[PDB]
């Protein structure tokens, strides 16, 4: 049924039109905190900000701001934190958020450099013996092991709160093969990655929300959240064909602006949900 809708949109060539309708219908809420002068260097892109109502607040005392939003999908029963790729001055804030929100997994959808442009800071350690200390937020981060596969890498990180000496294992799920331009021709590897994140236990409601990012935290990150949420809704709804991807995306857009940045990402999302549903 979704596949009938897909073939019809493809045949009529109206992805751009449907995508522009989503842009026009999307929620508009204030982002006053993100736009305060004191937060200018905490934002990677001046045009991508978290709404005040859904922003993640840091708990330490001087400035609570991080460019990150809680996407709480009530019907699907899953929450996600979508955030920009950390900046050189916000890596301590990023790991403070992971600690305070009790997240178990981090999903990264970009390479640190793509087409010779930096998309995010090197915010985790690449060598076991070269741990990172974030002196502003008093956290230590150590690479324990990594499992490098052809299309993604999963890293076992140890995050230590240096104040209390408590440690937690964080799983870093890094999809390394999104194309430099456009979307993947096939959703197969993206879906395999999505199911590996699920299989790891990182999305269990016993943990805090998974932290998802790319460079701005809206495009590829939106595709991941949209596909994961729609697949959940299909497994729960009495009639799985009732899941309307455009409606789900507009729901997500109540929590963070700009999710899904191109008509091609919208088409890819439909394609990933259709193929993933067959798998389940
Ligand atoms: Cl200010
Ligand atoms: Cl990388
Ligand atoms: Cl729906
Ligand atoms: Cl947009």
Number of helices: 7
Catalogue the ligands. Answer: chloride ion
Global morphology: globular
**Main sheet record:** 9 strands, mixed
Proportion of residues in helical segments: 25-40%
Strand content: 15-25%
**What is the structural class?**
alpha/beta
Strand order within the widest beta sheet: 1-2-3-11-4-10-9-8-7
The termini sit apart by 16 Å
List the helices and strands in order. HHEEEHEEEEEEEHEHHH
Radius of gyration: 18 Å
| Count of beta strands | 11
Number of individual domains: 1
Molecular structure report:
It is built from 7 helices and 11 strands. A hairpin with a 5-residue loop joins strand 9 (152-161) and strand 10 (167-175). The chain has 280 residues and is α/β, with parallel strands linked by helices. The two termini are 16 Å apart. Helix content is 31%, strand content 22%. It has a 9-stranded mixed beta sheet with strand order 1-2-3-11-4-10-9-8-7, sandwiched between helices. A two-stranded antiparallel ribbon has the order 5-6. One chloride ion binds at residues 111-112. One of its GO terms (biological process) is cellular response to angiotensin. The modification Cysteine sulfinic acid (-SO2H) is found at residue 214.
């Amino acid at each position: 049924e979704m596949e009938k809708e897909f073939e019809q949109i493809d045949k009529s060539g109206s992805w751009a039109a449907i995508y522009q309708d989503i842009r026009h219908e999307a929620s508009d809420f204030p982002c006053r905190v993100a736009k305060l002068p004191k937060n200018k260097n905490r934002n990677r892109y001046r045009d991508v900000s978290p709404f005040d109502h859904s922003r993640i607040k840091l708990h330490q005392e001087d400035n609570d701001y991080i460019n990150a939003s809680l996407i709480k999908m009530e019907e699907a029963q899953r929450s996600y934190i979508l955030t920009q790729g950390p900046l050189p001055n916000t890596c301590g804030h990023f790991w403070e958020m992971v600690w305070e929100q009790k997240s178990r997994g981090v999903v990264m959808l970009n390479r640190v450099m793509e087409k010779g442009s930096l998309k995010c800071a090197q915010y985790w350690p690449q060598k076991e013996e070269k741990e990172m200390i974030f002196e502003d937020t008093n956290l230590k981060l150590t690479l324990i092991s990594e499992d490098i596969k052809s299309y993604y890498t999963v890293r076992q990180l140890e995050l230590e709160n240096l104040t209390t000496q408590e440690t937690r294992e964080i799983l870093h799920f890094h999809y390394t093969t999104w194309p430099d331009f456009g979307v993947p021709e096939s959703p197969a590897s993206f879906l395999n990655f999505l199911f590996k994140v699920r299989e790891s236990g990182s999305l269990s409601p016993e943990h805090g929300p998974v932290v998802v990012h790319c460079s701005a935290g809206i495009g590829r990150s939106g595709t991941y959240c949209l596909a994961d949420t729609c697949l959940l809704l299909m497994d729960k709804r009495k009639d799985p064909s009732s899941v309307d991807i455009k409606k789900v995306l507009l729901e997500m857009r109540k929590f963070r602006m700009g999710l899904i940045q191109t008509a091609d990402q919208l088409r890819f999302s439909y394609l990933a949900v259709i193929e993933g549903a067959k798998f389940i």
